């Protein structure tokens, strides 16, 4: 008896792989010990970081009337989010394209 | 004859090229560029297609937003017009030049 | 005098000033005077240097001749420019 | 060659949040891009963290503190959240 | 005395005497 | 009442020339000190802090203002001016990456 | 009503207008308006506070309430602003 | 029982001049950029060692982490000092 | 029967220290190992920076007329020389100043 071998994402609850988290933890040259809890706590957060842009990247395709992501719809998603515009603050997404803004002095005076 | 007011055309192609994606560099003309500034450094230099395309994009992403502050430079100088000094204040700033 | 040399030179006048206007209309810029396209062709050929100089500094010592896209992402992740949708 | 990735987690993330959406490849290599980005941060910060304290293990309270140093405000508040109740869920289970 | 190490990088001279003299400010200041 | 007075001008010269030789911190200690305390009881309470740290803290304040009023003075003499102006101030945050 | 409150909140106008004057002295400026002083509080004030969250945050994590000068330097080092003189 | 540079700096300052002293707070500053500099080298080096799949660090990836971060002429004579120092050590 | 010991600084020809140098970089988390000429080439790469920096402090210490380096010399050192500041552009030295410059359109007339 083994116990059927139940995994450590689905006893976190997680979508990411834990074990994969933790073998890149261990042999990424971070420590020489890694704890038990550090792997399910990374994978949790990239598991809520990814949510939460594919969320807002899901919405972005819908208000174009899509239904498949392309990076515009990342980039669009990044730049319109206050928060997600500083953890991403100095990272070129490809084919990404910028925000249409126009500086109202530009803009012709009626 | 029909023509359009000076500035009408400059906000058609502004919202046209931001809401745009691709590449506005052709490819031939960033490869040998790439190639001449590559062989400077090292000779008999080869180079997959995915690098030159990586770095056309980081190209056109450091010149759209160095562009951007160069039209802020020239906004808070009272002038719609970007001058060579503007990007020089935006590079200055910035700390790319000194 | 048909012949003549084989390589080129004038490949930063390749980069046209439709290109330069298209860059500066996405940067929403209105109104360009005539000497922004120099500038902006060295201030491409200084970024162009350093990122390549990085990426053959990685190619070297990986004792390779070609230069990869995964170096070209590292020479620009250590310049604090990193760029998504090649790998990493 | 088996090449590993987060390709199919991040699917089934998006399958979660968009049941109806699809994705496109540059997309996904985006997205695999951007957690391979996130995590070498956090786990370089934890790293440091755990050099500056003179000890030899990473744990989760490293990885709570890098995430509360490097995630900007209310996106740090969720997530440490969200990775609090994972642990404490696996400590319900193993 | 002499040193024994020196550097090989083709550096210019530098002046690096900050101490300054305000004599080309006496128009305003005293005249 | 007195004569001889100065133009306006040559005196901030002067204090030009004056503190860019000087290397003493130009903020007194104590109210950055209370500053310091102010701001950080906002994030934990019951917090001690060595002097050290606040001078290292009054170090880089002084250097950042420093060098944000460099950038500003040449956002203020880019514009044909050479009075500094809160704008000025908001154009270099926003080229520096701080306001962007 | 001779009693009062322990607390003072004026604090950021003890960084008076003659030291926003020096500050700016050292930075070569010549003439400085009169709306100057209440954005450098601002801004000294906004970057006070990201520095010290950040030290903070390091102090809890190594179970202190004492904010010693390493995590003042280890705070200013993860923003991008390394300090000299205080880290040996 | 401090772990300092100090010592060293001040034989090196001996060696470039040797009637000139040294305050303590130029010194600590001289210990921070030392280990500043000692980090930043380890660091490419390491990150050129996990790119081509390397378990070890080698004087090449010095070589190449000084010729990433250093520029100029600095790269160049540091890369002539290193190698003497190197083929110094090796005959002998 | 030992032999007569021997630095490694010594046989390198260094001042810095290779043992201190090696052990840092073993116990740093860099790697899983660390050849025998890394430690060396670090060393010389430190100490050949050391002495560019000392050099030129001292030299803006003997046209100041001092005979001791104070953090005022290193910071002119460093920012006079375009290769050192911008190796330390993102460096803040602590009790330094800055460098002594005015625009010219503040200055009075010709």
């Known amino acids: 008896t083994r116990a059927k071998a139940k995994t450590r994402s689905s006893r976190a609850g997680l979508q990411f792989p834990v074990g994969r988290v933790h073998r890149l933890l261990r042999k990424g040259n971070y420590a020489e010990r890694v704890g038990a809890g550090a792997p399910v706590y990374l994978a949790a957060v990239l598991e809520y970081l990814t949510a939460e842009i594919l969320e807002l990247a899901g919405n972005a395709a819908r208000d174009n009337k899509k239904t498949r992501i392309i990076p515009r719809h990342l980039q669009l998603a990044v730049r319109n989010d206050e928060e997600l515009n500083k953890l991403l603050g100095r990272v070129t997404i490809a084919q990404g394209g910028v925000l249409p803004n126009i500086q109202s002095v530009l803009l012709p005076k009626k | ?98 | ?88 | ?94 | ?31």
Request: with cysteine; hydrophobic share 35%.
């Open chain 4, 1 to 94: 060659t088996r090449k590993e990735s987060y390709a199919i987690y991040v699917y089934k993330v998006l399958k979660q949040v968009h049941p109806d959406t699809g994705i496109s490849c540059k997309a996904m290599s985006i997205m695999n891009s951007f957690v391979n980005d996130v995590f070498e941060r956090i786990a370089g910060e934890a790293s440091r963290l755990a050099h500056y304290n003179k000890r030899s293990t990473i744990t989760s309270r490293e990885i709570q503190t890098a995430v509360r140093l490097l995630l900007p405000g209310e996106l740090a508040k969720h997530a440490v959240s969200e990775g609090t109740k994972a642990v404490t869920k696996y400590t319900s289970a193993k």
């Open chain 2, 1 to 98: 004859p029909h023509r359009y007011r000076p500035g009408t055309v400059a906000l058609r192609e502004i919202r046209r090229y931001q809401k745009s994606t691709e590449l506005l560099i052709r490819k031939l003309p960033f490869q040998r560029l790439v190639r001449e500034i590559a062989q400077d450094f090292k000779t008999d230099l080869r180079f997959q297609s995915s690098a030159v395309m990586a770095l056309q994009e980081a190209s056109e992403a450091y010149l759209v937003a160095l562009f951007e502050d160069t039209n802020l430079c020239a906004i808070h100088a009272k002038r719609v017009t970007i001058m060579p000094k503007d990007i020089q204040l935006a590079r200055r700033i910035r700390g790319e030049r000194a």
């Open chain 5, 1 to 31: 005395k002499i040193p024994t190490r020196f550097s090989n990088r083709q550096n210019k001279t530098v002046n690096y005497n900050i101490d300054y003299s305000d004599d080309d400010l006496l128009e305003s200041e005293d005249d």
């Open chain 3, 1 to 88: 005098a048909k012949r003549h040399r084989k390589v080129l030179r004038d490949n930063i006048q390749g980069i046209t000033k439709p290109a330069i206007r298209r860059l500066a209309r996405r940067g929403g810029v209105k109104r360009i005077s005539g000497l922004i396209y120099e500038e902006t062709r060295g201030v491409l050929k200084v970024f162009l240097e350093n990122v390549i100089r990085d990426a053959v500094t990685y190619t070297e010592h990986a004792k390779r001749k070609t230069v990869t896209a995964m170096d070209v992402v590292y020479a620009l992740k250590r310049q604090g420019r990193t760029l998504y949708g090649f790998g990493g």
